[PDB]
Design a protein around this ligand. Structure first.
Ligand SMILES: COc1ccc2c(c1)/C(=C/c1cnc[nH]1)C(=O)N2
Length: 298
């Protein structure tokens, strides 16, 4: 760790504190991740150490490279490759003009490819979000910081606790599903797809209940008709307000029909009815895909 000179704070997260560092020996710039441990009342730090190393062999052009893991003391560090910008800073710097469709489509195609990859290895991300997506000058985009089945260590008290932004969280996770599948990542990606098009978060909930109701008000309240088993779910309540379903024309304009269709299959309430990453790659929406490069101010 002392073999890395910090440059600046590159990011955050519930899992740790991301920094832009330079290898004192190599010279190459990396993205070092500080993960503090709770030696007061620790739990399965060895069960995790193995789940982290399984990520080192997870190489794909659309997945940020985990270079190496260094466990020294009360801290655990993850050395990642560095890209020049996260999709949040880019979207914000594009709120005025809007990310061109060819670029939005290129991005979705790659994300779906990398997501399709890690999925075929029974690996999920669980916490997809624009700040976790890294882009470069050459027009590529990668998925970053794959969350574990159960995070660990010690939460941040300065950044303001553990649970913060739950805008792209799937309804099954909100309804209490403890054994969720690859579908949670697709929902999240579907929410990012929409935000990139409309230039406004699809479902910007403050809390869990608000997130869930924010989804209900737009896609209508789920029932046994559209989501078999929804009412038997751990956190469902018969007293849930019953809202009407809205047209995607009103939800994601001016996305063409090809886009609204694909996004509609990504935001299906029923996890088992939700479109798979590799299935979404064959969608007609990707008929005329290309890889244009972004305009970046670094
Ligand atoms: C959140 O997790 C990660 C992991 C590896 C990373 C970055 C973020 C990351 C973010 C970032 C934001 N501005 C340039 N890079 C980076 O470059 N490499």
């Amino acid at each position: 760790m002392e073999n890395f000179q910090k440059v600046e704070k590159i990011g955050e997260g519930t899992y740790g504190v991301v920094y832009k560092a330079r290898n004192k020996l190599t010279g190459e710039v990396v993205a070092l991740k500080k993960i503090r441990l709770d030696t007061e009342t620790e739990g399965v730090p060895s069960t995790a150490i193995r789940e982290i190393s399984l990520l080192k062999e997870l190489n794909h052009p659309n997945i940020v490279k985990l270079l190496d893991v260094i466990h020294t003391e009360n801290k655990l560090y993850l050395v990642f490759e560095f890209l020049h910008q996260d999709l949040k800073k880019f979207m914000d710097a594009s709120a005025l003009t809007g990310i061109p469709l060819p670029l939005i489509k290129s991005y979705l195609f790659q994300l779906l490819q990398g997501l399709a990859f890690c999925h075929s290895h029974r690996v999920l991300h669980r916490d997809l979000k624009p700040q976790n997506l890294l882009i470069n000058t050459e027009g590529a985009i990668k998925l970053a910081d794959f969350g574990l089945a159960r995070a660990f260590g010690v939460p941040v008290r300065t950044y303001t606790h553990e649970v913060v932004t739950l805008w792209y969280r799937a309804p099954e996770i909100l309804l209490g599903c403890k054994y969720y599948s690859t579908a949670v990542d697709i929902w999240s990606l579907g929410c990012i797809f929409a935000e990139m098009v409309t230039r406004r978060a699809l479902f910007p909930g403050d809390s869990e209940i608000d997130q869930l109701f924010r989804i209900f008000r737009t896609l209508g309240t789920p029932d046994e008709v559209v989501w078999p088993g929804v009412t038997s779910m751990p956190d469902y309540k018969p007293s849930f307000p019953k809202w009407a379903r809205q047209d995607f024309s009103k939800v994601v304009p001016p996305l063409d029909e090809d886009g609204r269709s694909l996004l509609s299959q990504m935001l299906h309430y029923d996890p088992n009815k939700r479109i798979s990453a590799k299935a979404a790659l064959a969608h007609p929406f990707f008929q005329d895909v290309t890889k244009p490069v972004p305009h970046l101010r670094l």
